Design a protein around this ligand. Structure first.
Ligand SMILES: *[C]C1=C([C])[C]=C2C(=[C]1)N([C][C]([O])[C]([O])[C]([O])[C]OP([O])(=O)OP([O])(=O)O[C][C]1O[C](N3[C]=NC4=C3N=[C]N=C4[N])[C]([O])[C]1[O])C1=NC(=O)[N]C(=O)C1=N2C#C[C]N([C])[C][C][C]OC1=[C][C]=C(Cl)[C]=C1Cl
Ligand SMILES: *[C]C1=C([C])[C]=C2C(=[C]1)N([C][C]([O])[C]([O])[C]([O])[C]OP([O])(=O)OP([O])(=O)O[C][C]1O[C](N3[C]=NC4=C3N=[C]N=C4[N])[C]([O])[C]1[O])C1=NC(=O)[N]C(=O)C1=N2C#C[C]N([C])[C][C][C]OC1=[C][C]=C(Cl)[C]=C1Cl
Lengths: 503, 511
């Protein structure tokens, strides 16, 4: 039944459990309330005979995501490289264009320069931002007033390199470039390791998945806690005016504790009614950090027909109409159950959600067909999907995004405690915020904060550096001499003394 | 005790009660749950001996706000004109500049053109937007991707007319021009009756207040319901999968009903846990409609010293440092308790809130001093303030604002019902959304929707036009011939660029 504990953790997510774990290891009586009838939250592994196991939520891990990898291993969970042996393909206006490498290739000289200048510039601006304190950047104020679009259109002279920029935004933040803050975005990418890493599959965060499903990490870490993790128990009230903190749920349950760690998305923090009304700053901020929109879709075929054309599941579709933006081969390691994973992002997310499951499915197939070639794409065996906009206790999926003007006003708070209530959740991470590893950073960070508050941990050993995973080495990023110096579209015209004319 | 009712209304605000009222008048067993220990919500009249009565929240009403005026009167509440007999003043870079009229005057020719072009253009674009469906406008998609700043900087050539535009945004939406959607804003202003009305005091929505406090409207309409309005009962759960809708609060209470009307701010809708998880669209939208930031501040003096200089309380301060943006004479009708009402908006809101009450107060006085003149401004008798960012069950104050890209994606839902749950709240109004009158539009609209769902009201008589208040006539808006035609800064260059070809082409051929 409902009793008294030392620390009560709201959130059965990775970040939640991570904290719960660490806390138990310090022999602390911690309780963990989860609202869903399951655990893992934004990470969710669906199991049925048609697919065995599938990460319908969080799934990919990579090179610098040491924190998650470590915890993953400790829990006895394996990683498996994502298939990229074949060719990648870019679908632009006309048709499909095979290619190999990080980003697709651009052959128009001007575009090429603009395109390159883009990525390079975004990273240049990024270096100027404090990973742990975006709002502290030099040009911090000027930038946060600018929409990622504004910025993109201010540095892209090629309609090509520009639309591409947009997509990049869609793919990494599940939102439109005009919906988010340039300042924030620049940070998000930087906080992950620059454009290169955040996008690469061969050496990026999309390098590999978990054998058995990323979901397992939460499931596992729950078994180690067992008794101390109440499911279907949505926290709904936190009263911390007394010597003991009160915490009642929606099950009508009641629990008291000495400290609280919130391991749920900032925006969802509002599902809770706080006794001493939270401070303006927080109160105000908790209503400005929206969850992006995405529908993860896996289409299963009886055979990886794309391999027959030296094409790996990966496709980068740039075409208004098309439902999916990017895709990947989600076939199993043992070649079992070939399938293709694709994403429906931002604007498209809501648009396609207006259709019937079947129709949507079709649309997707019809697409994969044209992009690839063989109509073998029109005859799927099974189809699994997940629209995270529906989820009440998640809001959306690739974390929350900061809109224009918010980062530089109420941002300084995300991780700041509100008297005995500490904050976790990947949204408060510093490295890979938004990703699973990001969740861990926080889950633990918050945990240690509370431990320090109990005298068990020094104010120093609260923020701990992670040992580079020897199983997934952090191969440095090769930055070509050309890339480092090739002029920008404007740069080329300033070299060719071209600005004194009427084009 | 917690029983069964026909309709349960979440929200003891004006829009809430309005609905509750209308529903009772149709002999419907309706219940109204309010989270605060009081009623009126964003409208709140503070009472103490030092000020008798003061609207520390919503307060002004005007010419086209017929809905609120009507309900106000019916409840036996009077209105009193806002003082503007004296001179208004604009505080710019240098010092104070007296003036009379709607907007302050701009004397630099170019500025004047740009400045004028501004307002006119905002209204032109507005006319193109469907009051009841912003997202339906022609250039709807192009605009909603553009920040009100983006737009302002794209049509203002004068650093002057531009900074002014910003302020206008701050004052009307309690947010920064770069935080909100140009599309949305343009609508907000249009939905109120264009720039002219939304800002004017002499014939605008700031024409007059309620004698006794706007708060009274809710308080009153509560007495008519009495028993059927539970205070300190924050709704926390809504289960509507059964034949009867379940609704539990935070008091541990439980109520069942046939229909629900949500009369609370969109963003605050999330304080509730819904049984059948709301649809993506709504779910998604409910996390994108933030409440602006403002701190209403009244400073009381023993004498309206500003009247001694032919200055009425009104001041329009344009200067980064200065705490208050705009002010008004908040003295009482009978000259009793002279005082000045000022606002601390957007960025400034949070900044000043970091100070100690006393310090803030000082800063404000020090300002009023310089702006006006006499140091009599440094010796206040009493000071009352309210920072609405603090409020848990309100979020902020001049309603919610739509950020870039949201209106054209999830906007189409604000008023749309989610199975037996209908939506009220001023944020869903069509006329004066954000204002008290706006609240009423909705409160009733939603009410009728539910009545119609009960067969008591036709699908037609659901959206009812309001009879123009004969006590506060809707005087039309005079649009000068000059204003209607004077060229824009670009326009003047386009015209001159041709006066040049004409003068030099005519003369040269001659010699
Ligand atoms: C959704 C999603 C998707 C779809 C995908 C993905 C994701 C997502 N991710 C992310 C993750 O998942 C996250 O971050 C995590 O999970 C987080 O965690 P946390 O922090 O812990 O949180 P959560 O989970 O949310 O949880 C919470 C919890 O709690 C609860 N609650 C609430 N409220 C409440 C509660 N309880 C009580 N009470 C109350 N009130 C809930 O319910 C829960 O449980 C990810 N991540 C990572 O790491 N990875 C991955 O993979 C992922 N995924 C993704 C990504 C993507 N990216 C970005 C992009 C991609 C790209 O791709 C590419 C590239 C290149 C080329 Cl060429 C191609 C392609 Cl395709
Ligand atoms: C805050 C604010 C202020 C400060 C001011 C003002 C305002 C405000 N306003 C607004 C109003 O107030 C509003 O809109 C209303 O009130 C709304 O209503 P409704 O819709 O009903 O809502 P509410 O109230 O919020 O309520 C809700 C309720 O519910 C509850 N809850 C929540 N949640 C929950 C609950 N319960 C249970 N459960 C749950 N969950 C709450 O608590 C509540 O109770 C206004 N309006 C009008 O009409 N008027 C006025 O006056 C106002 N005010 C303002 C305005 C301003 N404007 C815009 C601008 C100004 C300008 O000025 C000038 C001009 C010219 C010259 Cl030369 C100078 C100057 Cl200074």
């Amino acid at each position: 039944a409902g009793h008294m504990f030392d620390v009560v953790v709201i959130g059965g997510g990775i970040s939640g459990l991570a904290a719960a774990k660490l806390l138990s290891e310090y022999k602390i009586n911690v309780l963990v309330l989860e609202a869903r009838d399951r655990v893992g939250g934004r990470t969710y592994t669906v199991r049925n005979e048609h697919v065995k196991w599938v990460d319908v939520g969080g799934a990919y891990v990579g090179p610098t995501q040491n924190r998650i990898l470590r915890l993953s291993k400790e829990l006895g969970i394996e990683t498996y490289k994502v298939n990229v042996n074949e060719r990648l393909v870019q679908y632009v206006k006309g048709k499909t264009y095979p290619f190999r490498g990080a980003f697709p290739p651009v052959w128009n000289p001007l575009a090429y320069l603009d395109y390159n200048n883009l990525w390079r510039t975004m990273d240049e601006m990024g270096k100027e931002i404090p990973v742990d304190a975006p709002w502290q950047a030099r040009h911090a104020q000027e930038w946060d007033k600018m929409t990622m679009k504004d910025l993109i259109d201010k540095i892209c002279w090629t309609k090509t390199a520009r639309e591409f920029a947009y997509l990049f935004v869609n793919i990494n933040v599940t939102s439109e470039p005009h919906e988010v803050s340039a300042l924030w975005f620049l940070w998000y990418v930087r906080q992950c390791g620059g454009t290169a890493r955040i996008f690469s599959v061969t050496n990026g965060g999309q390098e590999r998945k978990f054998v058995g499903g990323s979901g397992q990490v939460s499931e596992q870490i729950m078994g180690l806690l067992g008794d101390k993790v109440k499911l279907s128990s949505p926290v709904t009230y936190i009263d911390q005016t007394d010597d003991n903190i009160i915490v009642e749920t929606l099950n009508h349950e009641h629990y008291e504790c000495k400290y609280v760690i919130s391991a749920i998305p900032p925006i969802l923090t509002a599902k809770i009614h706080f006794k001493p009304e939270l401070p303006p700053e927080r109160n105000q901020l908790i209503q400005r950090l929206p969850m992006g929109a995405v529908i993860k879709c896996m289409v299963y075929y009886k055979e990886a027909f794309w391999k027959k054309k030296d094409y790996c599941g990966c496709m980068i579709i740039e075409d208004e109409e098309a439902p999916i933006a990017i895709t990947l081969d989600d076939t199993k390691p043992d070649g079992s159950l070939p399938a293709i994973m694709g994403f429906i992002l931002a604007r498209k997310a809501d648009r396609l959600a207006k259709l019937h499951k079947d129709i949507r499915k079709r649309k997707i197939c019809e697409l994969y067909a044209k992009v690839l070639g063989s109509q073998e794409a029109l005859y799927p065996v099974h189809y699994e999907e997940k629209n995270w906009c529906e989820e009440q206790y998640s809001g959306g999926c690739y974390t929350a995004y900061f809109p224009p003007g918010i980062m530089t006003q109420y941002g300084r708070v995300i991780r700041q405690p509100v008297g005995r209530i500490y904050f976790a959740g990947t949204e408060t991470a510093t490295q890979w915020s938004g990703y699973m590893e990001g969740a861990v950073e926080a889950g633990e960070r918050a945990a240690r904060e509370v431990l320090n508050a109990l005298g068990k941990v020094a104010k120093k050993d609260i923020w701990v550096e992670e040992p580079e995973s020897k199983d997934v080495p952090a191969i440095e990023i090769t930055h070509t001499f050309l890339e480092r110096n090739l002029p920008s579209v404007p740069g080329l015209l300033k070299i060719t003394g071209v600005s004194t004319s009427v084009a």
